[PDB]
Design an enzyme around this catalytic site. Structure first.
Site, PDB file in Angstrom:
ATOM      1  N   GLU A 128     -24.838   3.865  20.757  1.00  0.00           N
ATOM      2  CA  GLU A 128     -24.605   5.125  20.044  1.00  0.00           C
ATOM      3  C   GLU A 128     -23.731   5.076  18.784  1.00  0.00           C
ATOM      4  O   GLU A 128     -22.738   5.796  18.684  1.00  0.00           O
ATOM      5  CB  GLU A 128     -24.018   6.137  21.030  1.00  0.00           C
ATOM      6  N   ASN A 170     -28.400   0.157  21.457  1.00  0.00           N
ATOM      7  CA  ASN A 170     -28.845   1.255  22.320  1.00  0.00           C
ATOM      8  C   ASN A 170     -28.379   2.607  21.800  1.00  0.00           C
ATOM      9  O   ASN A 170     -27.278   2.728  21.268  1.00  0.00           O
ATOM     10  CB  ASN A 170     -28.314   1.027  23.746  1.00  0.00           C
ATOM     11  N   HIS A 207     -33.582  10.298  26.956  1.00  0.00           N
ATOM     12  CA  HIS A 207     -33.117  11.396  27.791  1.00  0.00           C
ATOM     13  C   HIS A 207     -33.826  12.623  27.222  1.00  0.00           C
ATOM     14  O   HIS A 207     -33.369  13.219  26.244  1.00  0.00           O
ATOM     15  CB  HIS A 207     -31.597  11.555  27.683  1.00  0.00           C
ATOM     16  N   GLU A 236     -32.729   4.442  29.581  1.00  0.00           N
ATOM     17  CA  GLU A 236     -32.104   5.419  30.460  1.00  0.00           C
ATOM     18  C   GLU A 236     -32.964   6.658  30.662  1.00  0.00           C
ATOM     19  O   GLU A 236     -32.465   7.773  30.657  1.00  0.00           O
ATOM     20  CB  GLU A 236     -30.747   5.808  29.868  1.00  0.00           C
ATOM     21  N   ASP A 238     -35.079   9.792  31.819  1.00  0.00           N
ATOM     22  CA  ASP A 238     -35.039  10.923  32.738  1.00  0.00           C
ATOM     23  C   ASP A 238     -35.613  12.097  31.946  1.00  0.00           C
ATOM     24  O   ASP A 238     -35.339  12.255  30.751  1.00  0.00           O
ATOM     25  CB  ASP A 238     -33.635  11.241  33.293  1.00  0.00           C
TER      26      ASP A 238
HETATM   27  O1  LIG Z   1     -24.319  11.439  26.044  1.00  0.00           O
HETATM   28  C1  LIG Z   1     -25.531  11.767  25.381  1.00  0.00           C
HETATM   29  C2  LIG Z   1     -25.577  13.266  25.094  1.00  0.00           C
HETATM   30  O2  LIG Z   1     -24.493  13.628  24.251  1.00  0.00           O
HETATM   31  C3  LIG Z   1     -26.906  13.590  24.398  1.00  0.00           C
HETATM   32  O3  LIG Z   1     -26.996  14.952  24.154  1.00  0.00           O
HETATM   33  C4  LIG Z   1     -28.196  15.400  23.491  1.00  0.00           C
HETATM   34  C5  LIG Z   1     -27.856  15.941  22.100  1.00  0.00           C
HETATM   35  O4  LIG Z   1     -29.065  16.383  21.439  1.00  0.00           O
HETATM   36  C6  LIG Z   1     -29.736  17.428  22.162  1.00  0.00           C
HETATM   37  O5  LIG Z   1     -30.873  17.771  21.449  1.00  0.00           O
HETATM   38  C7  LIG Z   1     -30.126  16.937  23.563  1.00  0.00           C
HETATM   39  O6  LIG Z   1     -30.767  17.982  24.279  1.00  0.00           O
HETATM   40  C8  LIG Z   1     -28.863  16.506  24.303  1.00  0.00           C
HETATM   41  O7  LIG Z   1     -29.208  16.023  25.594  1.00  0.00           O
HETATM   42  O8  LIG Z   1     -28.011  13.209  25.240  1.00  0.00           O
HETATM   43  C9  LIG Z   1     -28.013  11.794  25.540  1.00  0.00           C
HETATM   44  C10 LIG Z   1     -26.721  11.414  26.269  1.00  0.00           C
HETATM   45  O9  LIG Z   1     -26.718  10.023  26.546  1.00  0.00           O
HETATM   46  O1  LIG Z   2     -22.135   8.696  35.762  1.00  0.00           O
HETATM   47  C1  LIG Z   2     -22.193   8.896  34.335  1.00  0.00           C
HETATM   48  C2  LIG Z   2     -23.188   7.919  33.711  1.00  0.00           C
HETATM   49  O2  LIG Z   2     -24.484   8.154  34.242  1.00  0.00           O
HETATM   50  C3  LIG Z   2     -23.204   8.140  32.193  1.00  0.00           C
HETATM   51  O3  LIG Z   2     -24.077   7.246  31.583  1.00  0.00           O
HETATM   52  C4  LIG Z   2     -24.202   7.365  30.151  1.00  0.00           C
HETATM   53  C5  LIG Z   2     -25.101   8.557  29.805  1.00  0.00           C
HETATM   54  O4  LIG Z   2     -25.217   8.683  28.368  1.00  0.00           O
HETATM   55  C6  LIG Z   2     -25.794   7.515  27.759  1.00  0.00           C
HETATM   56  O5  LIG Z   2     -25.852   7.734  26.393  1.00  0.00           O
HETATM   57  C7  LIG Z   2     -24.927   6.284  28.044  1.00  0.00           C
HETATM   58  O6  LIG Z   2     -25.527   5.137  27.451  1.00  0.00           O
HETATM   59  C8  LIG Z   2     -24.817   6.096  29.558  1.00  0.00           C
HETATM   60  O7  LIG Z   2     -23.983   4.980  29.837  1.00  0.00           O
HETATM   61  O8  LIG Z   2     -21.887   7.931  31.650  1.00  0.00           O
HETATM   62  C9  LIG Z   2     -20.908   8.840  32.210  1.00  0.00           C
HETATM   63  C10 LIG Z   2     -20.820   8.640  33.725  1.00  0.00           C
HETATM   64  O9  LIG Z   2     -19.875   9.545  34.278  1.00  0.00           O
END
Ligand SMILES: O[C@@H]1[C@@H](O)[C@H](O[C@@H]2CO[C@@H](O)[C@H](O)[C@H]2O)OC[C@H]1O
Ligand SMILES: O[C@@H]1[C@@H](O)[C@H](O[C@@H]2CO[C@@H](O)[C@H](O)[C@H]2O)OC[C@H]1O
Ligand SMILES: OC[C@@H]1O[C@@H](O[C@@H]2[C@@H](O)[C@H](O[C@@H]3CO[C@@H](O)[C@H](O)[C@H]3O)OC[C@H]2O)[C@H](O)[C@H]1O
Ligand SMILES: OC[C@@H]1O[C@@H](O[C@@H]2[C@@H](O)[C@H](O[C@@H]3CO[C@@H](O)[C@H](O)[C@H]3O)OC[C@H]2O)[C@H](O)[C@H]1O
Ligand SMILES: O[C@@H]1[C@@H](O)[C@H](O[C@@H]2CO[C@@H](O)[C@H](O)[C@H]2O)OC[C@H]1O
Ligand SMILES: O[C@@H]1[C@@H](O)[C@H](O[C@@H]2CO[C@@H](O)[C@H](O)[C@H]2O)OC[C@H]1O
Ligand SMILES: O[C@@H]1[C@@H](O)[C@@H](O)OC[C@H]1O
Ligand SMILES: O[C@@H]1[C@@H](O)[C@H](O)OC[C@H]1O
Ligand SMILES: O[C@@H]1[C@@H](O)[C@H](O)OC[C@H]1O
Lengths: 436, 436
Positions: A128, A170, A207, A236, A238
């Site tokens: 990120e 990533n 995501h 990742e 989902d």
């Molecule tokens: O940690 C990350 C989140 O901050 C991230 O949040 C996304 C931001 O853009 C929105 O359009 C999405 O709906 C929202 O999920 O998502 C990925 C996660 O890894």
């Molecule tokens: O349990 C939570 C983890 O599932 C989470 O994992 C992160 C989700 O956002 C992605 O952008 C990251 O790469 C990934 O590691 O982190 C927080 C933890 O509490």
């Protein structure tokens, strides 16, 4: 083989993995699913910066090795997650800036990769580093301030520490090709490859939700990055609601790209998900396979032969040659379905929804009144219950998500009027269905 | 005061109640809802046998009184539940049989009714005395074994203990007229009226699910019992899935029978339900009104004088005369909807499901990615999230279940292309929609 996700993916030289949480390895229900379905593992938190280096200089690999060992012992490779990141940084790193941080980052990389040297298939070296401001520029972080060249340094460092590991960048929201973030990441990687920076892969967190929906152009994004000369991986995954079509689409995008190493979903059961409210994974909290699970398995296995009754279609029993029919086109809840000579009629037109329902009349759902053999299969108002969700097996069988039982023509009857029930799958012809 | 269930039910001379759990009364979200919406209260468990007579001859009314005190303190009447039952019997009673159990039964009725004498509107004197084997016969319990006359004895004892209360016989699976159990109870009640056995009411629990779904012949069942000279009441209503139509239908059935005193739903929020897995009530765990709530309220208020868009239809804003339109007939998730000249096109045909979804294209749902004002209303794959469920208020406005906000035509725009958003509900014409 072809009965589990990992085995199915392996057929094409790919892997299907998950994110393992160390605290759950003591849960048999959890490990029974994990050890069976996945051949790739990513420690959900155990291998992050704060977890592997609680104090500068002092590394802790206890929790991480726990996950690593379980993985290798159960036949799974491992994706290291993650070395350089602005988040989940231990407190001491959150206060470091300038040339000292840059040095701290380099040490951390050497330390963690040294420990796991030669044991990690893929390392998310940097995670990120781009913002969501819509400009396509670097995210503003202590790491980014040490110098724009920090990402490059991180990757060069990694290559040295362990040349055997594939090095990945990533990030999330870099799946839709029209996004500036996507383009910024694309330009960076192209540059790295031109200048010779050691990067072997790009991880797409993937995501998806209604906030940032999946878009068919995701494949275009993967193909473009692959054309740069780097591997790509869904890291990742989902999907909010776990739509069958979307899960199948992401799966097919990877399969359509030669360089797509595999797919990792972020968790085992919905109850293990960091976003359980979106029931975004492939297994229910009770451990049952969701509709999306079978849509993924089928895609990995190559699927069927010809297109399905995309929205609206008859379901014909193989052994009987008759269609699933709602008696006298009744709309009464509780009406048990039957077998009947196929003919154009709404009471014989079923639509399979992304949620896994078999709908009739538009708002009526194939419904199982119980979970044991003999349970009656009828129509009932649609509401989203698991007893109204079905998995469409590639072998022609239709299985209830909640019950794990097959649609079955009572006693193997083939005549008009034969009723439908749930029963232990037997591969019998009265449990196999096709298209008219 | 047609704005709350209780007040709206009162305009037809009826009540609308719920089941209260004393242990949740300290929960402000629970009480805010319960106090506002219902004017009748039933103790979910606090007035049962085990709870009121823990040891033989030793009565305890603390739990019962907590519920009662709250009921009267907030202007609600109370249904006593329940005096004689084969279930939830304290251990000392389960060990009894014969004449000793017969007298214990009578002693219990006398002790409980005496404490509440003159304070209870209705008492479920006997609960679930009939079997489900489909024979319409009596349930085989220690109570039935004391003699077939035990139910009659219970009612005579009850009339004598408190002649000011309506004496009810309460049971489940007695809503569908074609079921033997329903007729078995009908024959008993008829017998009692003929021989002068004291009985003023029959309670139909109404726990509807795919195992025993609601049937429109429920209206005839209510009419049939009413004709015996007894009042009838829907006592523990909950519907698996909470279908808006089923909830509205049950409401109308009661309103069709002059002797139907009212309706009680078994619980406040789905999370308070004994069957939360069936999300069978009218409020969500977060306290928000569900689609079914609005349907019951509208039903109680007599409904619309003209049939809604049954099976697809357009949604036209009043302040613009334009229809809800999906830009360029796109089927891409994330596409914000707009206002546009009404025309016979599928991208303008919306279907309201019993689950409260506004579907388009068959499997796409009106979706809101956020709960605040300005949140864009778009389309996304249907998965059942509360951000995909809407309530159709009588005032013509469409409110989001999860957000509690109304569909709003941005900046009160009226021209084609005007986007739709979520905004604090107003009586404005840019938040009003006519069902055409
Ligand atoms: O940690 C990350 C989140 O901050 C991230 O949040 C996304 C931001 O853009 C929105 O359009 C999405 O709906 C929202 O999920 O998502 C990925 C996660 O890894
Ligand atoms: O349990 C939570 C983890 O599932 C989470 O994992 C992160 C989700 O956002 C992605 O952008 C990251 O790469 C990934 O590691 O982190 C927080 C933890 O509490
Ligand atoms: O509950 C008692 C009876 O059992 C069910 O009816 C059974 C039916 O379930 C059974 O189905 C056969 C079982 O073997 C499978 O191989 C075959 O595919 C399947 O059709 O056939 C006999 C019938 O009596 C009902 O619950 C009730 O009849
Ligand atoms: O899960 C623990 C607590 O159980 C719920 O309370 C239930 C109560 O709702 C239930 O009521 C019965 C339902 O069946 C009807 O036929 C009968 O008349 C009615 O009294 O009885 C069991 C009791 O455990 C609590 O809400 C939940 O917290
Ligand atoms: O304890 C009682 C249950 O045994 C009863 O079960 C019902 C059996 O018939 C089915 O059709 C119903 O769906 C099911 O609920 O329900 C009431 C409960 O008090
Ligand atoms: O961004 C602005 C919106 O916040 C604004 O919202 C309006 C608020 O008042 C309501 O009465 C209106 O219906 C609603 O549109 O609209 C203009 C937009 O630029
Ligand atoms: O289609 C009808 C079916 O639903 C019933 O039996 C008669 C058939 O014609
Ligand atoms: O047209 C007929 C149809 O109405 C009936 O339901 O099934 C047989 C068909 O031939
Ligand atoms: O969605 C709109 C479509 O319905 C209309 O026909 O043409 C203009 C489009 O924006």
């Amino acid at each position: 083989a072809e009965s589990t996700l990992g085995a199915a993916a392996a057929q094409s030289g790919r892997y299907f993995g998950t994110a393992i949480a160390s605290g759950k390895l003591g849960d048999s229900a959890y490990t029974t699913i994990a050890s069976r379905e996945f051949n790739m593992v990513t420690a959900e938190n155990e291998m992050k910066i704060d977890a592997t280096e609680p104090q500068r200089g002092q590394f802790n690999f206890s929790a991480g090795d726990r996950v690593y060992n379980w993985a290798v012992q159960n036949g799974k490779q491992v994706r290291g997650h993650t070395l350089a990141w602005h988040s989940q940084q231990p407190g001491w790193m959150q206060s470091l800036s300038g040339s000292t941080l840059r040095q701290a980052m380099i040490d951390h990389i050497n330390g963690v990769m040294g420990h796991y040297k030669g044991k990690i298939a893929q390392w998310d070296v940097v995670n990120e580093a781009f913002s969501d401001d819509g400009s396509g520029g670097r995210r503003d972080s202590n790491l980014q301030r040490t110098g724009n060249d920090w990402i490059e340094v991180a990757f060069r460092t990694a290559r040295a520490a362990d040349p055997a590991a594939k090095l990945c960048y990533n990030d999330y929201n870099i799946e839709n090709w029209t996004w500036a973030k996507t383009q910024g990441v694309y330009n960076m990687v192209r540059d790295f490859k031109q200048r010779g920076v050691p990067i072997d892969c790009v991880g797409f967190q993937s995501h998806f939700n209604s906030g940032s929906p999946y878009n068919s152009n995701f494949r275009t994004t993967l193909q473009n990055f692959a054309a740069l000369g780097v591997d790509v991986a869904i890291t990742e995954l989902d999907i909010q609601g776990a739509s069958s079509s979307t899960y199948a689409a992401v799966t097919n995008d990877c399969l359509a790209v030669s360089r797509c190493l595999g797919i990792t979903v972020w968790g085992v059961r919905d109850t293990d998900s960091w976003r359980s409210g979106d029931t975004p994974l492939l297994f229910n909290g009770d451990g049952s396979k969701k509709a999306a699970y079978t849509a993924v398995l089928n895609a990995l296995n190559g699927g069927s032969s010809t297109p399905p009754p995309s929205g609206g279609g008859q379901i014909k029993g193989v052994g009987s040659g008759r269609c699933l029919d709602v008696p006298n086109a009744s709309t009464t809840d509780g009406t048990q379905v039957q077998l009947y000579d196929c003919h154009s009629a709404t009471n014989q037109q079923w639509t399979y929804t992304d949620a896994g329902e078999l709908r009739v009349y538009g708002d009526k759902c194939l419904d199982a009144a119980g979970t044991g053999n003999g349970t009656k299969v009828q129509i009932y108002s649609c509401w989203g219950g698991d007893n109204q969700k079905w998995r469409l097996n590639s072998d022609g069988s239709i299985v209830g998500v909640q019950s794990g039982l097959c649609l079955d023509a009572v006693g193997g009857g083939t005549a008009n009027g034969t009723l439908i029930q749930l029963y232990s799958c037997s591969n019998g012809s009265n449990q196999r269905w096709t298209r008219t």
